[PDB]
Each structure stands twice: as structure tokens, then as C-alpha cells.
Structure 1
Amino acid sequence: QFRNRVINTKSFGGQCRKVFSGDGKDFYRLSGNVLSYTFQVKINNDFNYE
């Protein structure tokens, strides 16, 4: 199970760290401290008939 909030993910640190999500086609503000956050997609399909 995922559990409760432990890290503050939205301390911007006085930075204006815009990222443009090419997926959502929108700008988001990253925190000042997160190392990376990126929006490239993978899709995996497994399909079985018996």
C-alpha cells in the first residue's frame, strides 16, 4: 500500500521552475528541489486468447 504524505513535493524554494508537459500541453511549476520530472509515454499491451 501507498501510505501518507511524507515529503513536501511543492516547496518551490523561491524558484520559478516552469516545465511544459508535451502530454498535457500545459505548463506546470516543478518544486525547486526535485531532480527531474518528465512526461514521455510508454504503452505496453499483453493480449491472450485461449
Structure 2
Amino acid sequence: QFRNRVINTKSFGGQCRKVFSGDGKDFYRLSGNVLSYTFQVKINNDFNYE
């Protein structure tokens, strides 16, 4: 199970670290700490009918 909030992932550190998500097509502000946050999609489909 995922448990409760441990890291402050919205600590911006005074930076204006915009990222454009091509997926959501919107500008988002990353926290100062996060090493990367990226939006490339992967879609991984198993059908198995018998």
C-alpha cells in the first residue's frame, strides 16, 4: 500500500522551473528538488482470449 505524505514535493525553492507537458499540453511548475519529471507515455497491452 501507498502510505502518507513523506516528502514535500511542492517545495519550489524560489525557482520558476516551468515544464511543458506535451501529453497534457500544459505548463507545470516542478519543485526545485525533483531530479526529473517527464511525460513520455508508454502503453502496454496484453490480450489473451481462450
The answer, yes or no, to whether TM exceeds 0.5 is yes
Provide the aligned C-alpha RMSD in A.
0.4
| TM-score (ref. length: structure 2) | 0.98
TM-score by length of 1: 0.98
Q: Which runs of 5+ in 2 are unaligned?
A: none
The answer for unaligned runs of 5 or more in structure 1 is: none
Q: How many positions carry a matched residue from both structures?
A: 50
Higher strand share: 1
The aligned residue for residue 18 of structure 2 is 18
Give 1:49 shift: 1.2
**Where does structure 1 differ by over 4 angstroms across 4 or more consecutive aligned residues?**
none
Superposition deviation, residue 19 in structure 1: 0.1
**1:4-48: CA deviations, max 9, x gaps?**
000000000000000000000000000011000000000001001
CA distance in 2 between counterparts of 1:49 and 1:5 reads 40
